[PDB]
């Protein structure tokens, strides 16, 4: 008890950042996946103190942080060193964040949990599973030779706003506020391109590509609902993969949000593996 210490902090400094990364690595290796910590958000000063660091004789063994992204909720990331689990560390860390979230007119807190780790007991105490977030990677240097579909592909320009806004409205319905200007931001940023898939003369799908020097990231893949289930999505992803490989990139990444595990088979079939996976559970503060 003498060496147990909790510091409430508005922003982590160099020290506190490097300790958090160490704890993250130990959790990552022990559990396979880690919650989202948003390391860029932690170097940044905020109105209330936002991170709760748990030390035992100077060593960081526990961490809780709270995040304010949208109006109705607060995202909570919690990490305890595997050595020190089930000793109350996480519970104590919650009590420190509570008075602060009541200072913000928030009563709903959402936890990011490594996939498969905590399913049985988040059920028991009333947590509501919401959705899952997967970061996937394909290290295979061999291209995808297989999906011959009646599709042609072209790169999107600023004249493709209506196509891109229409595709996003029906494939990402609870998301698209001011898509016009979001796609305008994307198409004005050199690191991004958007592939449009065409079935005859109809655009039926799109995929975003964020290029880096040695990799590229696919995101916001969409196929018109009436055209799904015909292999067009797999053909579009494979086209982006072969495009990425032909530019000498050694890796394709992919961010995807799902509500069940079955939806990932699609990406497994194309050579992706899970690098990180989190399920987002919910609860109001009333249920302690």
Ligand X SMILES: CC(=O)SCCNC(=O)CCNC(=O)[C@H](O)C(C)(C)COP(=O)(O)OP(=O)(O)OC[C@H]1O[C@@H](n2cnc3c(N)ncnc32)[C@H](O)[C@@H]1OP(=O)(O)O
For ligand X, the binding residues (CB under 6 A) are 27, 31, 35, 78-80, 85-91, 111, 113-114, 117-118, 121, 171, 219-223, 228-234, 255-257, 262-263, 265-266, 269
Which helix or strand (DSSP H or E) is residue 17 part of?
Answer: helix 14-31
> Whole-number minimum distance, CB 267 to ligand X, in Å?
8
Largest CA distance in the chain: 72
State which residue, 111 or 192, has the beta carbon closest to ligand X. Answer: 111
> Whole-number minimum distance, CB 147 to ligand X, in Å?
6
State which residue, 52 or 111, has the beta carbon closest to ligand X. Answer: 111
> Whole-number minimum distance, CB 205 to ligand X, in Å?
6
Distance CA(28)–CA(26), nearest Å, equals 5
164 is in an annotated binding site: no
Spatial contact of 283 and 129, defined as CB atoms under 8 Å apart: no
State which residue, 89 or 240, has the beta carbon closest to ligand X. Answer: 89
Spatial contact of 69 and 88, defined as CB atoms under 8 Å apart: no
> Whole-number minimum distance, CB 15 to ligand X, in Å?
21
User: Per DSSP, what are the bridge partners of residue 192?
Assistant: 210
197 is in an annotated binding site: no
Give the CA dihedral 220, 238, 225, 175, nearest 10 degrees. Answer: 0
228 is in an annotated binding site: yes
Which helix or strand (DSSP H or E) is residue 187 part of?
Answer: helix 179-187
Q: Count other C-beta atoms under 10 Å from residue 62's C-beta.
A: 24
Q: Count other C-beta atoms under 10 Å from residue 197's C-beta.
A: 28
State which residue, 75 or 160, has the beta carbon closest to ligand X. Answer: 75
Distance CA(138)–CA(155), nearest Å, equals 22
Binding annotation for acetyl-CoA: 78, 80, 86, 88, 90-91, 113, 118, 121, 125, 220-221, 223, 228-229, 231, 233-234, 257, 266
Q: Which residues are annotated as a binding site?
A: 78, 80, 86, 88, 90-91, 113, 118, 121, 125, 220-221, 223, 228-229, 231, 233-234, 255, 257, 263, 265-267
């Amino acid at each position: 008890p003498r060496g147990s210490m909790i510091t409430q902090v508005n922003q982590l400094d160099e020290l506190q950042l490097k300790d958090l990364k160490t704890l993250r690595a130990e959790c990552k290796k022990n559990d396979g996946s880690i919650p989202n910590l948003y390391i860029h958000i932690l170097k940044q000063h905020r109105s209330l103190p936002t991170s709760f660091l748990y030390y035992q004789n100077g060593a960081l063994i526990g961490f809780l942080s709270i995040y304010f992204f949208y109006d109705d909720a607060v995202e909570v990331a919690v990490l305890v060193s595997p050595q020190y689990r089930r000793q109350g560390i996480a519970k104590q860390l919650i009590k420190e964040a509570l008075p602060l979230i009541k200072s913000q007119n928030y009563f709903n807190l959402i936890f990011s949990c490594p996939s498969r780790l905590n399913d049985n007991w988040l059920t028991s105490k009333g947590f509501t599973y919401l959705h899952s977030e997967y970061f996937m990677e394909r290290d295979d240097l061999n291209p995808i030779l297989d999906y011959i579909r009646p599709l042609s592909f072209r790169m999107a320009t600023l004249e493709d706003i209506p196509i891109l806004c229409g595709l996003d409205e029906v494939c990402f319905p609870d998301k698209n506020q001011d898509s016009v200007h979001r796609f305008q931001q994307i198409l004005n940023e050199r690191e991004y391109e958007i592939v449009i898939a065409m079935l005859n003369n109809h655009p039926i799908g799109k995929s975003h590509i964020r290029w880096q020097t040695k990799r590229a990231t696919l995101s916001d893949i969409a196929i018109l609902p009436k055209e799904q289930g015909k292999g067009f999505g797999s053909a579009l992803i494979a086209h982006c993969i072969n495009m990425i490989l032909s530019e000498g990139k050694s890796r394709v990444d992919l961010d995807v949000e799902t509500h069940n595990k079955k939806a990932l088979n699609l990406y497994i079939q194309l050579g992706f593996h899970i690098q990180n996976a989190c399920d987002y559970w919910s609860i109001n503060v009333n249920q302690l």
